[PDB]
């Protein structure tokens, strides 16, 4: 489905000190009648001389993928994409978490299987467990493991933070938690990573604070309500 309203724009790091025009010497000569398949977002490198100019496919029509036919009417549309696009270098995958091959296996069996294979659990008839509580020495890779197992699975993610909720004034935490849970449930399947849960639900003896008690009670009441079985 050769594209019509395609968009092809270059990258900043390769257009610095560029030799000049790219439409008639870098884009058209090597991509007119070339019939090269193109996918939106691909960083492809082309040469119209000694300088190699990377290009990012901003937009295509059809949006997903197409082929660069002479029907493609776009030129070098001015704007060079900055390196900031690679600053969010696809966050974290799986190869970026290493050294633990059993804890990650348990987390996968508890998370990726219920959210991608309810048929097995329905056939056996078991109720899969929801709550998971990572712990370990500080700075050992807990948040990283959670991000790796929640970004690779492609499910809706929701990263609540301990101090972030605690920093807000009294009367807002009780609303923020409920709004967070009600938003997460609405987008099944959903993962709610509550980092530093020890800050918002400490040991009751060690606090003796009214607002702490109230927020703990709100968290408990909300948590007991996750029995909707809506993949949260």
């Amino acid at each position: 489905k050769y594209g019509k309203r395609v968009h092809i724009l270059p990258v900043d790091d390769t257009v610095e000190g560029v030799t000049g025009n790219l439409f008639d010497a870098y884009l058209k000569p090597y991509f007119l009648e070339a019939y090269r398949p193109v996918r939106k977002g691909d960083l492809f490198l082309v040469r119209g001389g000694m300088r190699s100019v990377e290009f990012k496919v901003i937009e295509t029509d059809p949006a997903e993928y197409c082929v660069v036919a002479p029907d493609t009417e776009i030129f070098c549309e001015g704007e060079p994409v900055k390196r900031e696009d690679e600053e969010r270098l696809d966050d974290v995958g799986y190869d970026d978490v290493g050294g633990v091959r059993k804890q990650m296996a348990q987390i996968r069996e508890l998370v990726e299987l219920p959210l991608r294979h309810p048929q097995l659990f329905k056939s056996i008839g078991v109720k899969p467990p929801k709550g998971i509580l990572l712990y370990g020495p500080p700075g050992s890779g807990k948040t990283l493991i959670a991000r790796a197992v929640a970004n690779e699975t492609g499910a809706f993610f929701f990263c609540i933070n301990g101090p972030e909720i605690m920093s807000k004034l009294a009367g807002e935490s009780e609303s923020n938690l409920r709004k967070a849970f009600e938003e997460a449930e609405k987008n099944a399947p959903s993962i709610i990573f509550i980092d530093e849960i020890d800050s918002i639900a400490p040991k009751r003896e060690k606090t003796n604070g009214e607002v702490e008690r109230r927020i703990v009670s709100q968290l408990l009441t909300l948590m007991d309500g996750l029995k909707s079985r809506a993949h949260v």
Binding site: E109, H117, Q119, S123, I124, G125, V126, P128
Partner: protein, 117 residues
């Protein structure tokens, strides 16, 4: 009628045990062998399971278990049974074979492993 609930009756307010307020106190203790057997029979009614299941042995081996822990044990047994079949099921294919989906059954060995874990 008012029905309280607690864990240690000593920790409650001592003024709530006076005549007329809370005058009946009942102790829901840890079940014995027959209790554990009945709890397991209640919980494993819906699960598929092979005829080899020896619930009496599981009841006798479990000591100090309560109802919640026995529910967790049954769930662990089912998860172990799924995990042992995982070596042939491919996660990239959401089209799990229907005969495969109906060829999975929990046995006594999975229960023993879950009890060990």
């Amino acid at each position: 009628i008012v029905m309280g609930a607690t864990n240690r009756p000593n920790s409650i307010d001592p003024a709530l045990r006076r005549f007329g307020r809370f005058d009946r106190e009942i102790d829901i203790g840890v079940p014995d062998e027959i209790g554990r057997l009945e709890v397991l029979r209640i919980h494993t009614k819906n699960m598929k399971l092979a005829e080899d299941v020896d619930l009496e042995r599981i009841s006798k081996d479990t000591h100090g278990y309560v109802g919640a822990d026995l529910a967790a044990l049954c769930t662990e047994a089912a998860l172990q049974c799924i995990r042992e079949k995982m070596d042939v099921i491919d996660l990239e294919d959401d089209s799990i074979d229907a005969e495969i989906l109906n060829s999975m059954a929990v046995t006594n060995e999975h229960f023993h492993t879950a009890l060990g874990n």
